[PDB]
Amino acid sequence: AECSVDIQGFNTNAITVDKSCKQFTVNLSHPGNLPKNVMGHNWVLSTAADMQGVVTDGMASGLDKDYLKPDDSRVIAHTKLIGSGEKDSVTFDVSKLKEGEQYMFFDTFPGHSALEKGTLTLK
Ligand SMILES: [Cu+2]
Ligand SMILES: [Cu+2]
C-alpha cells in the first residue's frame, strides 16, 4: 500500500501507516515566505504520552538545536526544522511503531504545537 505522506506546514490532522509497510516517509513542505528563524516548522513523532515533554524541552533548547532537546530518546522520528522554500522528508522503521498505541505528530517551533499537531496510528 502507500507509505509516504505529503504534509504542508497542517493540511492533515491525521496519518495512518499501513501495518504492511516496512518503512514510512513524511515529506514536509513550508508554504510561506519567512526565514526558518522567525517562522520555521518541523514534524516530530512521539507517543501521546511523551508529546508535551518533547515540546517544552524542545522549546527550551534553541533554534540552534532545531527546537528539540539533544538525545531526546522519546522522539521516534522527525524532520529538520525548515523555513520558506525549504522542504524535508524523514523515513523511519515501521518496526519502531506498535499497533494499538497512540502516537502524536507535532511541530516544536515555539508555539506551533497548539495548531500544528496530529495523530498517527499503525493500522
Ligand atoms: Cu507496500
Ligand atoms: Cu510551525
Curated annotation (Swiss-Prot):
Superkingdom classification of source: Bacteria
Start and end residues of each Plastocyanin-like domain: 1-123
Cystine residue pairs: 3-21
A GO-annotated cellular component: plasma membrane
Intracellular or extracellular location(s): Periplasm
Pfam annotation, one family: Copper-bind
GO molecular function, one term: identical protein binding
Keywords: Copper, Disulfide bond, Electron transport, Metal-binding, Periplasm, Signal, Transport
Cited CDD domains: Azurin (cd13922)
Gene3D superfamilies assigned to the protein according to its UniProt record, in alphabetical order: Cupredoxins - blue copper proteins
Binding-site residues, Cu cation: 41, 107, 112, 116
Role of this protein: Transfers electrons from cytochrome c551 to cytochrome oxidase.
Protein name per its UniProtKB record: Azurin
Underlying gene: azu
